[PDB]
């Protein structure tokens, strides 16, 4: 089971991901990294602005299914 979280893919681009309250956070960067066409390394999900450790669970920082996260990928000049 599990409900969708809100991954804000960069800016102006948002993609709904399906994860459970156990999805880690780099693991979170991996799935979001899949739809972004980039590696979870460059990609980085931060919920509500709190830098979460890649070893914490989805219900750890308080993400929980449904959570506005901010993915960030070191963007070369456009």
Q: CATH fold of 1-78, please?
A: Ubiquitin-like (UB roll) (3.10.20)
Domain range summary for the chain, segments of one domain joined by +: 1-78
13 near 48, Cβ under 8 Å? no
Q: In terms of Cα–Cα distance, which of 20, 16, 15 is closest to 3?
A: 20
- Order of strands, edge to edge, in the sheet holding 4-8? 14-18, 4-8, 68-71, 45-47
Evaluated on CA atoms 64, 49, 36, 60, the torsion sign reads negative
Say how far apart CA 60 and CA 62 lie, in whole Å: 5
Bridge partners (DSSP) listed for residue 5: 17
Say how far apart CA 68 and CA 77 lie, in whole Å: 26
3-state secondary structure of 2: coil
Tokens of 33: 């990294």
Q: Please give, one letter per residue, the 3-state secondary structure of 7-60.
A: EECCCCCEEEEECCCCCCCHHHHHHHHHHHCCCCCCCCEEECCECCCCCCCCCC
């Amino acid at each position: 089971m599990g409900m969708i979280v809100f991954v804000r893919f960069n800016s102006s681009y948002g993609f709904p991901v399906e994860v459970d309250s156990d999805t880690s956070i780099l693991q979170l960067k991996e799935v979001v990294a899949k739809r972004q066409g980039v590696p979870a390394d460059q990609l980085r999900v931060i919920f509500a602005g709190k830098e979460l450790p890649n070893h914490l669970t989805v219900q750890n920082c308080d993400l929980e299914q449904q959570s506005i996260v901010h993915i960030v990928q070191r963007p070369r000049r456009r």
